[PDB]
Design a protein around this ligand. Structure first.
Ligand SMILES: *SCCNC(=O)COc1ccc(Cl)c(Cl)c1
Ligand SMILES: [Cl-]
Ligand SMILES: [Cl-]
Ligand SMILES: [Cl-]
Ligand SMILES: [Cl-]
Ligand SMILES: [Cl-]
Ligand SMILES: [Cl-]
Ligand SMILES: [Cl-]
Lengths: 238, 231
């Protein structure tokens, strides 16, 4: 059986994920090197990879059912306080952690060693989380709800926290329906609990990214673009 | 009498070297990294806020500071507090014995400090040994501490009254080095840039604790953290 609206919801969530992801069949290995340059170039690349995904991740956000119906202030805070979380999660799902290949949403493929000078040791945690994520063998339907749950959660400063809460419960309900239906009606309480357990791991992982942005901002070798600053200020807690 | 006024302002806002407080001190490493993280983070905040009342009284006892517009007095204080907190701690402490001595006389071992201060305390101790190897007398330190707060800022109301106060302090410092000591003044005044870099390590630590949200900073620490972020 299925919740009412569960099939149409999870279908729209899968379409949102597929439409906002890079063509694996036609990716870009132009700068890929398995085994350097100045610091300013690597930091600028770090900023540029973050910025380029912002517009794509918000396009994915606008294709979640009911997300557009929220107030714009709620849409902005939800998207902003979840951007790095979505950036990390979608990068960890997309990448090849065994080969150290980081695959970004514009299709650019870079090796883990090519990213350490921009990302810092934060790239080592992203690779580790990617292996753990991929070891769970999460299909696209279950991933698409987990991705939407990373954004549709409670945040301080929401104007109408119910529609968020009401949308979040519907996403949880259709993730449960899928896990049960896919397994032939047999519930999987372990896979689900481990699946939802990846959201706090992702939140912890994206504080490491905020510390990296704060570090680069204070040392002031390459100032962040204005939109990285706005991302930083609008999401500082309390 | 200006440098004597700065020396007395330092002496009055600092614990008498014989009235040290070992009530919290612990030499045994088994007990130096004990207890929950909450009381360790809270003690970290409490030492920071406990130094605000002390450094503020030290600033008011600097000749001419109180004669500035208080909007400038607050901008000067609230933008050098962490630098002053670290500089006075590094000058007060016993880095070779691993003893950090705070402005209330409380003595804590370095290993008692890592749970709250984090990695930051190692860099503080390193800076503390480098500072004391210069054997800066109390007269030159009182000038240097004042110069950490009486300096260039964006948004002051009479910035050249601060500058004229600043250069009065610089001139008497140079007069002191002349009478008493290529000189250590170049590396001494260079310790203020190195202090600033050490201060931004402290902001990283407070930023981390804010993100962890185990014990959120008090409003006063949160305000001054937010007020020194470069946008
Ligand atoms: S880095 C320049 C030194 N002084 C300051 O930053 C202002 O004093 C502060 C700064 C940050 C925090 Cl959290 C406090 Cl409590 C005081
Ligand atoms: Cl796309
Ligand atoms: Cl995919
Ligand atoms: Cl691959
Ligand atoms: Cl949830
Ligand atoms: Cl389904
Ligand atoms: Cl559940
Ligand atoms: Cl100077």
């Amino acid at each position: 059986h299925h919740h009412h609206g569960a099939i149409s919801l999870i279908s729209a969530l899968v379409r949102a994920h597929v439409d906002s992801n890079p063509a694996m069949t036609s990716l870009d290995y132009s700068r890929f090197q398995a085994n350097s340059g100045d610091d300013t170039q690597h930091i600028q690349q770090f900023y540029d990879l973050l910025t380029g995904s912002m517009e794509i991740i918000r396009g994915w956000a606008e294709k979640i059912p009911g997300f557009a119906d929220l107030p714009k202030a709620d849409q902005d805070l939800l998207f902003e306080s979840a951007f790095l979380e979505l950036f990390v999660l979608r990068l960890a799902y997309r990448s090849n952690p065994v080969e150290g290949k980081l695959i970004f949403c514009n299709g650019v493929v870079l090796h883990r060693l090519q990213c350490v000078r921009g990302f810092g040791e934060w790239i080592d945690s992203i690779v580790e989380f990617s292996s753990n994520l991929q070891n769970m063998n999460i299909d696209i339907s279950a991933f698409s709800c987990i991705a939407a749950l990373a954004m549709v959660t409670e945040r301080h400063g929401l104007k109408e926290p119910k529609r968020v809460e009401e949308l979040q419960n519907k996403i949880v309900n259709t993730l449960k329906d899928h896990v049960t239906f896919n397994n032939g009606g047999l519930n999987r309480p372990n896979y689900l609990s481990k699946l939802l357990g990846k959201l706090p791991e992702l939140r912890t992982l994206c504080t490491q990214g905020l510390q990296r942005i704060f570090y680069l901002k204070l040392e002031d070798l390459v100032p962040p673009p204005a939109i990285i600053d706005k991302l930083f200020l609008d999401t500082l807690p309390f």
